[PDB]
Amino acid sequence: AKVEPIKIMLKPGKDGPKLRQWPLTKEKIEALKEICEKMEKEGQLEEAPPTNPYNTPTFAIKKKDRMLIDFRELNKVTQDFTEIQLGIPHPAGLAKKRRITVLDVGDAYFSIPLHEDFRPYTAFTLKRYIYKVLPQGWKGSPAIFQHTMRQVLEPFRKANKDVIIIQYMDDILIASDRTDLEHDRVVLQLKELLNGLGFSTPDEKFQKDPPYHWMGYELWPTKWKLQKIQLPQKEIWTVNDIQKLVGVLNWAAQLYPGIKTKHLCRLISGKMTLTEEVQWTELAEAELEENRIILSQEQEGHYYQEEKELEATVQKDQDNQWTYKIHQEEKILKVGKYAKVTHTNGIRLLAQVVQKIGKEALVIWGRIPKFHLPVEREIWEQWWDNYWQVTWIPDWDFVSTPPLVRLAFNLVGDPIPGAETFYTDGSCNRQSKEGKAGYVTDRGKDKVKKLEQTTNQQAELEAFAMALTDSGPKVNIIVDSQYVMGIVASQPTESESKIVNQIIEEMIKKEAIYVAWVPAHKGIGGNQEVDHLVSQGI
Amino acid sequence: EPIKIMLKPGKDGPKLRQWPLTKEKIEALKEICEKMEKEGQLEEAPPTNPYNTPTFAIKNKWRMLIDFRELNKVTQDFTEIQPHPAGLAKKRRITVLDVGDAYFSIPLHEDFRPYTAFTLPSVNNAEPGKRYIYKVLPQGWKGSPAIFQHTMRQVLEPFRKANKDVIIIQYMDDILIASDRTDLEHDRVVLQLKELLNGWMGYELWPTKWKLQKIQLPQKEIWTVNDIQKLVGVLNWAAQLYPGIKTKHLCRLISGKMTLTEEVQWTELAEAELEENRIILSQEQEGHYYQEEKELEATVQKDQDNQWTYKIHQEEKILKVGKYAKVKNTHTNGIRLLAQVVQKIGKEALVIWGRIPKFHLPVEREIWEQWWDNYWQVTWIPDWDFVSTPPLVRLAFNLVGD
Numbered sequence: 001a002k003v004e005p006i007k008i009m010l011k012p013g014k015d016g017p018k019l020r021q022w023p024l025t026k027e028k029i030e031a032l033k034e035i036c037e038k039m040e041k042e043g044q045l046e047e048a049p050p051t052n053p054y055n056t057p058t059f060a061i062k063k064k065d066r067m068l069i070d071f072r073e074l075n076k077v078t079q080d081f082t083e084i085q086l087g088i089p090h091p092a093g094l095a096k097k098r099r100i101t102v103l104d105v106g107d108a109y110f111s112i113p114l115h116e117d118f119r120p121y122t123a124f125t126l127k128r129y130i131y132k133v134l135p136q137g138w139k140g141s142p143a144i145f146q147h148t149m150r151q152v153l154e155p156f157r158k159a160n161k162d163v164i165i166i167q168y169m170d171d172i173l174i175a176s177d178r179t180d181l182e183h184d185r186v187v188l189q190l191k192e193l194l195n196g197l198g199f200s201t202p203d204e205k206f207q208k209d210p211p212y213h214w215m216g217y218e219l220w221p222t223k224w225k226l227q228k229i230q231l232p233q234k235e236i237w238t239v240n241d242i243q244k245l246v247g248v249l250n251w252a253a254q255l256y257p258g259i260k261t262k263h264l265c266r267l268i269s270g271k272m273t274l275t276e277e278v279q280w281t282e283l284a285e286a287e288l289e290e291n292r293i294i295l296s297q298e299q300e301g302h303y304y305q306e307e308k309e310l311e312a313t314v315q316k317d318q319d320n321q322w323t324y325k326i327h328q329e330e331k332i333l334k335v336g337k338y339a340k341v342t343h344t345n346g347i348r349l350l351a352q353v354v355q356k357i358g359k360e361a362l363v364i365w366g367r368i369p370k371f372h373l374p375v376e377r378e379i380w381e382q383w384w385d386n387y388w389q390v391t392w393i394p395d396w397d398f399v400s401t402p403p404l405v406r407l408a409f410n411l412v413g414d415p416i417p418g419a420e421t422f423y424t425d426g427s428c429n430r431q432s433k434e435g436k437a438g439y440v441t442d443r444g445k446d447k448v449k450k451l452e453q454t455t456n457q458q459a460e461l462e463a464f465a466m467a468l469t470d471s472g473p474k475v476n477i478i479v480d481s482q483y484v485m486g487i488v489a490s491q492p493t494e495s496e497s498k499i500v501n502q503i504i505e506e507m508i509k510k511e512a513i514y515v516a517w518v519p520a521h522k523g524i525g526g527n528q529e530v531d532h533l534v535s536q537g538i
Numbered sequence: 539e540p541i542k543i544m545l546k547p548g549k550d551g552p553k554l555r556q557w558p559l560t561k562e563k564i565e566a567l568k569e570i571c572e573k574m575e576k577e578g579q580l581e582e583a584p585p586t587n588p589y590n591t592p593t594f595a596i597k598n599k600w601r602m603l604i605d606f607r608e609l610n611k612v613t614q615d616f617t618e619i620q621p622h623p624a625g626l627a628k629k630r631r632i633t634v635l636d637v638g639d640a641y642f643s644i645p646l647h648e649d650f651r652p653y654t655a656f657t658l659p660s661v662n663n664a665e666p667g668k669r670y671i672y673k674v675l676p677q678g679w680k681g682s683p684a685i686f687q688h689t690m691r692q693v694l695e696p697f698r699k700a701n702k703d704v705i706i707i708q709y710m711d712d713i714l715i716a717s718d719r720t721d722l723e724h725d726r727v728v729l730q731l732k733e734l735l736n737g738w739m740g741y742e743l744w745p746t747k748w749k750l751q752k753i754q755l756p757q758k759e760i761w762t763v764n765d766i767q768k769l770v771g772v773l774n775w776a777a778q779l780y781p782g783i784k785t786k787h788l789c790r791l792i793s794g795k796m797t798l799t800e801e802v803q804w805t806e807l808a809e810a811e812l813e814e815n816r817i818i819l820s821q822e823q824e825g826h827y828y829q830e831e832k833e834l835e836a837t838v839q840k841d842q843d844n845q846w847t848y849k850i851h852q853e854e855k856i857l858k859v860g861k862y863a864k865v866k867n868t869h870t871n872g873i874r875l876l877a878q879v880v881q882k883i884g885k886e887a888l889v890i891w892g893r894i895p896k897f898h899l900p901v902e903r904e905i906w907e908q909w910w911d912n913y914w915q916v917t918w919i920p921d922w923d924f925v926s927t928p929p930l931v932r933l934a935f936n937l938v939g940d
Contacts, residue, residue, distance in 0.1 A: 093662035366561030366661035390872030442796035
């Protein structure tokens with residue numbers, strides 16, 4: 001029963017490792033040889049021919065309750081593989097089934113032969129050995145293992161089209177609506193398939209009853225729950241400790257937003273011994289701290305019923321806080337948040353929430369939910385109908401989830417008869433950052449305001465603000481900045497900028513505002529005089 | 539035997555992400571690929587293959603749409619394929635057929651196959667991605683129509699002599715049958731041609747039914763200060779695209795006026811300048827400025843009147859402008875509308891210039907890339923980037939008409 005191992009290559013123009021074998025204590029070299037003794041016995045290891053020039057550092061670490069090879073250099077030279085599964089199954093997408101069973105594959109890598117031509121590079125000295133199976137810590141092991149497991153389970157899945165099989169790494173979840181007898185029988189059938197193909201399934205890694213521990217989740221029969229993820233809190237952090245830490249964070253970052261591993265990785269800047277103490281950086285320190293906070297949370301929800309409808313209800317909370325809930329009738333599958341961040345409005349942000357939820361739902365349920373939004377249809381449609389940018393919106397419903405998203409803009413398409421007309425402009429001295437913002441009106445008035453540490457754009461905006469501030473409930477304003485024009489057109493309701501905020505404040509008080517643009521420096525009546533007024537001495 | 543294929547110097551194969559799809563599309567895709575594999579057109583990709591191109595499904599039964607744009611950028615040669623008979627646009631009717639299935643009769647060189655890897659996702663990531671690579675010419679690769687030319691030539695060349703009135707040209711996975719025959723005589727030529735291929739998924743165009751539109755300056759009985767301000771504005775927009783456009787004299791009309799509702803007193807200078815500008819725009823839009831050596835571009839934007847318009851251009855040189863009728867369904871999806879406009883523009887560009895433009899779209903990259911495929915019905919995918927429509931451009935395009 002032999003399947004030929006997949007062929008592997010090193011990156012072009014590269015060679016296997018030939019690194020330094022650091023001597024270690026007598027006690028250590030004792031346990032190590034003991035370990036390798038067993039591995040060579042069982043078939044995981046084999047002795048290196050006298051012509052093998054390659055070598056990788058070996059280490060021994062105090063049992064996490066012992067041998068650790070530093071394949072960092074071999075990995076660096078190994079070809080790239082395919083990341084055959086980035087994304088973790090979410091229990092909210094798991095169909096509600098009568099029976100569930102969870103089980104792990106033991107020493108998964110030990111059951112997969114490494115190609116003869118590639119074993120040479122795995123060489124390490126103690127006697128010298130090379131791997132015959134996928135080495136733990138080697139770059140290609142998880143890609144090959146993942147691929148192999150998919151092929152082992154595929155025939156089982158097509159034989160039992162009604163059973164739900166979910167495999168992630170060496171964790172397999174089995175769910176079905178068969179009788180307790182039939183279910184257990186199909187699970188035994190699965191273990192028989194695996195064991196027969198050489199994959200062990202420890203009785204200890206087998207889970208008969210609830211709660212089922214599955215990938216950080218605890219699956220109860222009625223609901224699921226994401227446990228708080230605990231992160232190691234060591235005294236002295238070695239390169240290996242940071243590696244494992246970053247491994248966990250890599251997984252965890254799929255379950256939570258805001259997880260960063262950047263400055264944490266910069267701590268193990270390559271060639272440093274795998275045992276070498278890391279030099280803690282302030283930003284690395286800060287990163288781990290924020291990560292601990294983020295993960296010190298917990299989530300929960302119910303399971304999916306594909307026959308029933310999939311809905312999404314959104315609600316704006318405090319200020320930038322939008323929350324949602326994916327549900328089927330009154331049953332909530334999962335809850336979510338969005339507060340992502342210069343000057344938009346509720347309708348534009350609402351659309352961003354809808355996009356986020358839509359993307360998430362395609363991933364988990366393979367379908368788009370029915371949306372229930374806190375915004376009236378006429379308001380929504382009217383705004384997007386006029387806006388220059390298109391956005392995604394599937395069928396939806398309005399729901400009176402106060403507060404409602406409402407836009408109240410009195411921007412009119414034609415000059416307002418009788419309303420005073422303000423011509424706006426702002427200057428800025430490139431070198432002193434001193435400028436002026438002002439206006440001139442068709443009713444004879446004018447005003448100028450000196451600005452300091454400003455900018456052309458800021459001066460332009462300060463001028464528009466001045467016009468809004470000194471005008472009646474109805475006003476026409478002519479600007480020469482397409483920038484200001486763009487901003488006003490986007491009818492913003494929220495901004496970080498102080499001047500933009502005044503502009504919004506004033507704009508809401510107006511009954512009607514007509515705003516148009518004219519090219520600058522063309523001697524256009526009104527524009528030419530404000531231009532000269534604010535440019536004087538600037 | 540298959541010819542050796544090369545990636546451009548210093549370029550490697552695609553390494554793009556697969557996007558999440560609906561359950562129905564995933565099921566349809568897996569079925570398609572199962573058959574293709576069974577037919578020897580695909581084979582599973584090893585874990586040692588690091589490449590990946592995004593796959594999609596369009597629609598009824600589904601068709602697989604693999605997005606090989608990146609692979610096409612990195613493929614050496616096959617440049618002279620993206621040859622055109624300007625008569626095409628004059629034909630009364632054009633039938634476009636998707637002939638990509640035919641490619642599967644020709645093998646792909648074993649050394650290039652790994653770069654065609656693609657992945658089929660699974661709902662809720664229940665299982666790892668199912669990966670495949672092609673063993674034959676892939677639909678969507680620029681090299682396929684080229685390598686298939688001989689096989690295709692052995693059929694179309696005879697049929698072309700027997701119908702010298704009909705124009706039969708191929709662009710990528712498409713075959714255009716254009717002629718002036720009566721519909722039954724046209725449908726006849728089409729059925730014949732299909733019978734020859736078999737030894738469906740396509741659409742109809744009516745070129746001579748397309749109304750040519752142009753930028754046209756307003757004409758009013760009475761012009762106000764506001765009217766002249768608005769005119770000079772768009773004239774200023776045009777001055778960037780069209781040479782010779784001036785506004786000095788029109789501006790002078792309102793140099794001493796601030797009240798927007800006031801009527802301007804016309805001068806001969808202003809009138810001659812507005813007239814000169816009308817003639818310039820008219821004369822320059824009837825010109826021919828195309829350069830098949832420069833990228834063909836299309837920018838889409840919404841009118842200030844909220845109608846969809848576009849401009850076909852090369853840098854600042856505008857080759858064509860169009861405007862589509864306003865949409866009634868007030869609650870239609872934005873991404874849907876834009877996608878329909880894009881496909882209409884491309885189809886039109888294909889007939890006229892023989893190639894798909896690079897689009898500049900008024901949509902956020904992330905939203906567009908996530909949903910565009912749900913409203914796609916053609917087999918091609920243009921390159922595109924994302925842009926912001928300036929308020930002035932919205933007013934400028936209000937002038938497209940006729």
